Write a protein that binds this ligand. Structure first.
Ligand code: FAD
Ligand code: FAD
Ligand code: FAD
Ligand code: FAD
Ligand code: MG
Ligand code: MG
Lengths: 426, 426, 426, 426
């Protein structure tokens, strides 16, 4: 039955989220601010915060009970993500990115993959996982007929899969010391045999695990950071341009065989679309809160309070309205992904809707709040610039809206089985 | 606990709504279409349909069980309103307006007001009710200090209240024969004693009941239609410019005494704000459905299916995303209004949000699908033009966004007790 | 030398436009309102107006001096169109549609075509022209490799061309008495010899003249009015669904040989794009004027003038700003089309820009003004609803923004010779 | 005569602007980039290239011919500003800000003021001027009845004016060495006698010159930089929070006596509004060019060029359209400000319009281009982030759109003399 009240457990999640952001993430921010904005040392300095998160069981919660994890719901994740993004986006993302890295494992792992999950179930240390998908040259057209396909390839040679390629933007993939993370899910193209004339490129896509142990065993030059990328927000996040060279792994490392990889990757990106929605809600909440606090304490030298000016008030209420719509849609999507109604195609349309709606609304909200607050918002002592520069990544990352998210919505509607309102009216 | 599944009762509401719309409303439209677009004969011709709806208990459903009715939840009203607006907005509104007319009684009735509700609990005939608020000269500033205030006044003379003034836009107020509807809740300004220097005009606002009976007793010309207004949509809806001249009623007709009328009127308007949200969702659904249908069956003489144009698909998926957000927000507001969490001030901000967001989103969606369908959509054989001309009213009526709904949002934020997210997180 | 001042002549053009609109167009409106909105005899009552326009040399002005006319500049046309659309769009469009019909003749006519312009150069009566290009099944994809192409076809049987096809939306094509207009440029597909395998469907496109004399000559059944298309705006304009059956004409009637018709059609559409911009400017001007007028006389019962409300004033000034941008862009495109400094590609990018910017701005302006004016704008006694219903056609007619106008912009930019700012800086 | 062709003198200005930007501004950028992002040394490091611009005659060009300068038309200024902003906004703004500082003197100088202008007319050194208006507490309400008014005050004590107050954001006011620029136009309120009951605060507003020589004469503590403000773009621009303490100047230093200052300051801001339009155009051009460059050399791993994606193309053409409207509007305002037709009030409206339209269109263009380019736009190696962070200042600076520019538009429309289209057709 239609209910917007948090359960006692969901309220616990909210309170826990508040404490995590306040006690772990805020100190992480003061810590990385001690290094210049283009320094990879920002990322490295967050390792002790990450460890503290690990000790509190965050990584265990990112693994499904099927695999021995404690795993929660997308709804609970959405609540956590909103709160963290309202406080400290960059340090939070490093943690959420490990969750993304572990998602393909939740979706496709079998019993033989348990050994790979062990470091993450330990409840100690600071292991990092990464979903290693994107490439320097772009991947919006990795599955397009007539195109080159993924640049990163795997070849079965004897009893070993051999990986070669360059990747970029894959959060966490280089690990704390830039020599490779604990567990990478590398999305690549099987090239043991050539793509046949007219064959669907998706038939060749795999996901193969690569651990830090694999890289070490393969020795010098097997993994290399080609370029650290400085970004205008998320300054403690590390997703460098990297290269894998002749990285040989055992057959047990294959997660998704050729022809099953794309589906699992997009499956992982469906879940994260929901949390990108939550990211947007969190930034919008932070923007509204900061603008409202500005108004309530600063009348800009006027004869009346700032909120008594219709033009200012209407900008703020506009943001509040979009934020409330964004959270409702995000929760609807989080609920539907795990409960229906509607088949998977219908559930996924909502996750994509949340992603697209909230990411763009977050950018618009940030720009509106800047105009409302006025010239003061150009002062970097105030939070407004960082908010905007955090928001603008939402539409373009986790599968950009223009080149990926919207192309999928197109394919969904094209299907004969498309049933517009099934995700609502059963 | 966060849940978006419809209960059995909510599924039932939805099924009954589909039935009502297809079986009663659609025929009402075939009937009124036979009269000229700008003729009050359209409204008059809907009486048979209306009475049939009365026979199915629709009016009983607009009255709270506390007063003898079968009224349900705001959530169920949202589901009903969405479906009716997706099929036939004009015939639907005349019915919903009686519901609005009855709301102030549902909210503030005393034991002595039971007799006034009798015709509406009868289950037969075709009694009309009206919330009579708007006036030819505007009402956004009715409560504004230094302004004239309501043009409609009532003054206590002996043992009868005497009502004088002109109203406009008040749906149903003139009844089927244009000589006065069964039950009108007349909002007006006590003028028995003058507003005192600097006194809050809200102190004088009353709601007085006026029945067809009262009007008949008052004789020749106590009620007069001064002008029938022709509208581009809602053509079977009747809310003329009218005048009450020396309408004398017994003290039992007072629903809200001077200084209590404003709060009750605005309380009614908070509930209706949620349902305007639902109206917006329903038009959006109708526009998306019609556009999708067209696209599935006309490739515009193209070499591929219409949906295969990035540009066309993007307009439609844009509408879908906005509609899902609009419904999610509407249901959240519907739920919160009756369940919290948060102050009434908190709950209220969400109802206003739904009104503003969905009304404007409805107009955008209709504009978008017109562009997507193309030149064909100027063709009055298709539903698109009437969709737009219906949607355009949503932002301006039931308290316009610009001068009323946003002014209320402004005032809520201005309160020292404003607590932004209490309506979600407590 | 950059100059926005009207020359003496251009001021003359503007005064003439003002006079035409005030003395001819306004009365045409009061006149055609006497007849039904979906009736084609509303259209017939506008003849005296058209004939007065003809008397004043308007039609001679639509023909270039090369072909014996008194043709002016695109800038003067933009001035005229803006004024007319700010007053009376429907009656005005009948006149302008003749200008469009005549345009391919201005672009493509040779010595042998002089005979066809005679009725338009005589300064007598009320001859109508029409560019008959649009078909029931759409035409955005008539030029596309794989599609059924134009459904209207012409084939060379001996020494006469035989034309068969159905048409729609072609303003003016059926004449005053509905038996066919004086002069139609029929755009069609050469079905004399089948299109070759893998051949650009453009190669078979023609334009062929068809006079009322030709229709009369082919006798009964040669021209038939199938369906009259009712539209929400332009209610006095007649552009029905018609069929040409075995319409036989001499080889002199060919204006554009197979393979040349597409370029000339789009050439004509470039010119009109600029004028669609002017239409948009005109509607925006009227919307702003009406809203401003409303505000200066009606304070909506407020304690202060309506323009003292920030939210209201910002809506109005937003419209004023867009209108000024719209006109400045329209004039730039009008100037560049005939004067450079672009090459033809650069020039038409600006014409398309004007069409897209102003059409969309007009729709947005009409929506904004309705919200600003409020509930009063739903009253058909006021001009706001009609304004919206006219503007909504601008993005979709004369080559919709979505399936053609932007498709051409894309092709322009794809050319290796594209030089972004050459239309301004050389 | 409506003409969009540049004259030989305007072509000359364009060519000189290209050369100046490339030779002076680009090297300024490579120079200041050697210092940290937030360092005041970025500003200081631009002195040598500022001196080169001075030697090139740039400051002479900011002074009106009436004072011995070679200042040209606003149109030519708009051409220069667009080019400079398309190349290097930050170093450009420092130069343009000296022009703003000289503007009140161009507008109001008396014979006694020629000595103050002398340093700026020599063609050597690197003199800086500042219009010192803005204050930490805000200034949108400096003229509001019932408000505190400017915090910066001046009092006549004998034969000297004594100035006290804090200013913030006033570009260049602190000079190269942070101890005060060469020539500051300080906007302040006369506090010699108190404001009378219900008196217009405008009556007390003055502009008083303050030179570095004045500051040195007044001794230690008379001028102090309180805080250098770090900004997300314009990182070489210095407009710190500063304090003037008991700064005494002779009466010759008074530029606008009490009651004349506000009109001159706003006069300066009317001219600057046009040039902000041009800054907007320049950033839009730069964003469009950078995205087109990326598209023409990077197909994102596709089977077709990036421009063949309808999605990408539609985003770029949208930016191109807005840019053409922006420039057209800016040039119209430039021309009308100096040539009419219309009142000063009418001309003024167009300047305000260009500022509001173009500033907001620049922000929208930058966000659109980021979405089109995709994740690559988040890489600080590419120009898109810096473009956005430059663009967001435009709506909020030089008199913010929400608090100032739109309030001026509102006051214009409120005048009985308002004549909507006089600046076009008057
Ligand atoms: C902070 C951060 C964290 C990230 N996390 C990860 C991660 O954990 N793992 C990972 O693998 N990657 C990660 N990424 C990368 C991110 O997911 C990107 O969205 C991904 O690289 C795809 O980028 P894109 O959508 O721009 O596609 P691209 O291929 O780069 O396309 C770019 C643009 O080209 C256009 N385009 C291309 N093809 C088409 C088409 N067919 N139709 C229409 N338009 C088209 C679109 O306009 C699109 O916006 C991260 C990036 C950042 C900045
Ligand atoms: C189909 C239909 C059904 C209706 N049903 C009913 C009904 O059942 N009962 C009833 O009483 N009425 C009814 N109405 C009227 C409807 O409720 C209107 O919204 C109501 O009259 C208020 O209109 P408004 O908001 O435009 O206020 P107005 O006072 O008309 O204000 C108009 C505009 O002025 C501007 N404005 C005025 N004051 C301010 C301010 N202080 N600040 C900023 N801007 C301001 C705003 O832009 C506002 O939009 C109906 C109307 C229609 C068309
Ligand atoms: C008042 C009025 C006057 C008119 N006057 C004339 C006239 O004088 N002469 C004449 O010939 N016609 C006339 N027309 C019709 C006008 O020329 C139409 O614009 C023309 O028929 C093309 O319509 P369209 O752009 O909707 O294209 P259509 O082919 O009808 O398609 C419409 C929609 O299909 C989608 N679409 C189709 N293909 C694509 C694609 N490849 N990419 C993206 N989207 C696509 C687009 O979203 C587009 O909006 C008139 C119409 C009106 C209303
Ligand atoms: C790079 C840069 C260069 C600059 N150059 C100069 C310079 O050379 N000289 C100089 O003096 N300053 C300069 N400034 C400051 C600039 O001119 C600002 O626009 C100015 O300080 C006014 O800011 P504001 O419009 O936000 O007004 P504020 O008073 O700061 O108002 C802030 C916000 O409050 C709200 N508000 C306040 N009052 C009202 C109201 N009455 N109605 C509605 N809303 C209201 C509005 O949303 C407004 O945006 C510069 C600033 C920067 C960043
Ligand atoms: Mg009045
Ligand atoms: Mg203060």
């Amino acid at each position: 039955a239609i209910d917007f009240h948090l359960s006692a457990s969901q309220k616990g999640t909210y309170q826990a989220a508040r404490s995590l952001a306040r006690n772990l993430l805020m100190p992480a921010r003061q810590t990385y601010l001690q290094h210049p904005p283009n320094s990879p040392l920002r990322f490295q300095s967050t390792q002790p915060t990450y460890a503290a998160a690990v000790s509190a069981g965050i990584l265990k919660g990112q693994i499904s009970p099927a695999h021995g994890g404690t795993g929660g719901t997308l709804i609970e994740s959405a609540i956590l993500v909103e709160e963290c993004y309202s406080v400290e986006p960059s340090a939070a993302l490093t943690i959420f990115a490990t969750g993304l890295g572990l998602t393909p494992i939740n979706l496709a792992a079998g019993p033989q993959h348990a050994e790979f999950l062990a470091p993450f179930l330990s409840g100690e240390g600071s292991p990092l996982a990464s979903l290693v998908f994107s490439e320097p040259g772009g991947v919006a057209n990795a599955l397009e007929k007539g195109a080159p396909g993924f640049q990163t390839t795997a070849r079965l040679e004897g009893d070993e899969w051999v990986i070669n390629g360059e990747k970029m933007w894959a959060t966490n993939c280089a690990g704390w010391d830039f020599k490779g993370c604990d567990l990478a899910c590398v999305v690549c193209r099987d090239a043991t045999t050539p793509l046949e004339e007219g064959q669907d490129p998706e038939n060749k896509v795999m996901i193969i695990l690569v651990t830090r142990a694999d890289l070490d065993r393969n020795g010098e030059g097997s993994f290399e950071v080609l370029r650290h990328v400085a970004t205008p927000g998320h300054t403690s996040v590390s997703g460098p341009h990297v290269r894998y060279t002749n990285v040989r792994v055992p057959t047990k490392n294959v997660l998704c065989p050729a022809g099953q990889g794309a589906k699992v990757a997009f499956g992982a990106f469906d879940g994260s679309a929901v949390l990108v929605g939550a990211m947007g809600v969190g930034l919008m909440r932070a923007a509204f809160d900061a603008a409202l606090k500005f108004a309530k304490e600063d009348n800009r030298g006027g004869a009346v309070p700032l909120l008594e000016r219709q033009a200012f008030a209407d900008l703020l209420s506009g943001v509040k309205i979009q934020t409330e719509a964004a959270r409702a849609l995000t929760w609807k999507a989080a609920h539907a992904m795990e409960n229906g109604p509607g088949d998977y195609d219908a559930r996924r349309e909502l996750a994509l809707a949340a992603k697209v709606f909230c990411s763009e609304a977050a950018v618009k909200a940030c720009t509106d709040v800047i105009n409302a607050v006025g010239i003061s918002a150009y002062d970097l002592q105030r939070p407004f610039s960082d908010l905007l520069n955090t928001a603008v990544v939402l539409p373009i990352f986790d599968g950009g809206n223009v080149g990926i998210r919207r192309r999928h919505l197109q394919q969904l509607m094209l299907k004969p089985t498309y049933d517009a309102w099934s995700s609502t009216y059963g």
